[PDB]
């Protein structure tokens, strides 16, 4: 302990970006990411253009 | 699904994002390590 931690600090920060870079599936893909699972792609919307 | 009217606009930058703050820091980052003391 403090050796299993000091990467938990590193490991929780990468967990923050996977649920932030993809706001949809957020707070659930991190759950699946830890176990090595993936979300179904077709449900989510996506953006076409911005002006 | 019950909305039936136009919605308000969306900000281009939140106050927290502007100052890169956080409402509640996590307890794991710079966190606590268990101590044995029986």
């Amino acid at each position: 302990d403090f050796y299993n931690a000091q990467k938990m600090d590193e490991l929780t920060r990468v967990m923050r970006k996977i649920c932030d870079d993809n706001p949809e599936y957020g707070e659930e893909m991190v759950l699946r990411w830890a176990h090595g699972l993936s979300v179904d792609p077709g449900r989510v919307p996506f953006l076409l253009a911005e002006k | 699904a019950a909305n039936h009217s136009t919605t308000p606009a969306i900000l281009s930058q939140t106050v927290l994002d502007r100052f890169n703050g956080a409402l509640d820091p996590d307890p794991n980052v710079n966190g606590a390590v268990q101590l044995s003391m029986p």
Binding site: - | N30, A32, V33, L35
Partner: peptide, 7 residues
């Protein structure tokens, strides 16, 4: 039940 904390 205590902790020396990492900081």
């Amino acid at each position: 039940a205590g902790n020396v904390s990492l900081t």
